[PDB]
């Protein structure tokens, strides 16, 4: 009967950026969602698979919750069959996904009018992410002209760029902090 | 909250001493504990940051380690001028809180 | 030089209201933010909520909630803080330091207001 960490991961201090989502597997809790539902600053929280409702009284188990941070238009692909960049290099859902995503409004805490170089986000890859797995590579991409060996120049690209995040932008560039519960629904652990 | 035991709550040292501080956290907090010094009625300063890296000002005798649960602030050949009482300070998790905070007198 | 002074020391009644000062000066305002401390005399201190420096919007700490408000203006470089409703129990010391807005330790703190209450 001991609360589960809800707290330690919802209004924590630095959520990690988004080529490496930190990723916290929840387990042996009652997990009260009732917290969340009275927090109302919540700019989406779209659940894919249950509705939200009738999310209390169930039993889940082998649940995941994982955090970044993106720009506020590319929020819109941290959901099952999205394209873009975040979704095809980042972080993709796969097509069965069954949790939540949720979203803040965080130009209040990481925004500094000096730019906030600090996030980063991945720009290229040979190939596609697969669901579910974070690449921390940090090497140069390149088409095989010459290998550069780790050099920056013409038609050598250093693939983690970064974020502007500055508190003049707008309502769609401002950082957007993200959780992604994705539950798995074998003997239920979690419950209400 | 997370709320820092701090122990012990009185101490008894002399100069030329070494002698170990302790404050233990109550959930699991990533090395982000700072220490902070507060002699007699003035504002508090700063020690070392993240519990294991010093600031560039302090003197070359405190340095804390520890990373978890567990930290240690150990400060050897004290001087008797460095009295005062010392605060852990968390920055994991919201709201941000201190210990109750120890004296380190002397004899 | 880096410093915030503050406003001397004050005492009022019980029901009144209370404007403290935090002048900052001497690093450009913007890069950092602005937390409060309230240290009780006997006890440790107590995080009272940070303020952005550029826009002023506040976030009280969930004990602090009421009776506080963290106003901020930026014509001169000041930080205020404003208590209404004094009662019989926040006789203590104000301070104010500036804590980053990505690290979050309190290095340059002030010289710190005292605020007690009497009949």
């Known amino acids: 009967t001991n609360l589960c960490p809800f707290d330690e991961v919802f209004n924590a201090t630095r959520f990690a950026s988004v080529y490496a989502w930190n990723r916290k597997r929840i387990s042996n809790c009652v997990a009260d969602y009732s917290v969340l539902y009275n927090f109302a600053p919540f700019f989406a929280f779209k659940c894919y698979g249950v509705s939200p409702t009738k999310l209390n009284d169930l039993c889940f188990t082998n649940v995941y919750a994982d955090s970044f941070v993106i720009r506020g238009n590319e929020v819109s692909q941290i959901a099952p069959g999205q394209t873009g960049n975040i979704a095809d290099y980042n972080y993709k859902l796969p097509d069965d996904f069954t949790g939540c995503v949720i979203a803040w409004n965080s130009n209040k805490l990481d925004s500094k009018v000096g730019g906030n170089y600090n996030y980063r986000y991945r720009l290229f890859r040979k190939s596609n992410l697969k669901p579910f797995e974070r690449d921390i590579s940090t090497e140069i991409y390149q088409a095989g002209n010459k290998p550069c060996n780790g050099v920056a120049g013409v038609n050598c690209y250093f693939p983690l760029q970064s974020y502007g995040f500055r508190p003049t932008y707008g309502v769609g560039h401002q950082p957007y902090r993200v959780v992604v519960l994705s539950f798995e629904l074998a003997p239920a652990t979690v419950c209400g | 909250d997370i709320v820092l035991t701090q122990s012990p709550a009185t101490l008894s040292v002399t100069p030329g001493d070494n002698v170990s501080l302790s404050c233990r956290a109550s959930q699991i907090i990533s090395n982000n504990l700072h220490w902070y010094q507060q002699k007699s009625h003035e504002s508090p300063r700063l020690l070392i940051k993240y519990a294991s890296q010093s600031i560039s000002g302090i003197p070359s005798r405190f340095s804390g380690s520890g990373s978890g649960t567990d930290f240690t602030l150990s400060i050897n050949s004290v001087e008797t001028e460095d009295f005062g009482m010392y605060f852990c300070q968390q920055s994991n998790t919201w709201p941000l809180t201190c210990g109750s905070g120890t004296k380190l007198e002397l004899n | 030089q880096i410093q915030l002074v503050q406003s001397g020391p004050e005492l009022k009644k019980p029901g009144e209201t209370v404007k403290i000062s935090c002048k900052a000066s001497?690093?450009?305002?913007?890069?950092?933010?602005l937390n409060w401390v309230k240290q009780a005399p006997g006890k440790g201190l107590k995080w009272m909520g940070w303020?952005?420096?550029?826009?002023?919007?506040?976030t009280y700490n969930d004990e602090f909630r009421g009776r506080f408000a963290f106003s901020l203006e930026t014509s001169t470089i000041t930080a205020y803080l404003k208590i209404n409703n004094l009662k019989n129990e926040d006789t203590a010391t104000y301070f104010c330091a500036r804590g980053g807005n990505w690290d979050w330790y309190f290095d340059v703190w002030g010289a710190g207001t005292t605020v007690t209450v009497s009949s």
């Open positions: 303020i952005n420096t550029y826009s002023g919007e506040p």
């Open positions: 001497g690093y450009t305002f913007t890069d950092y933010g």
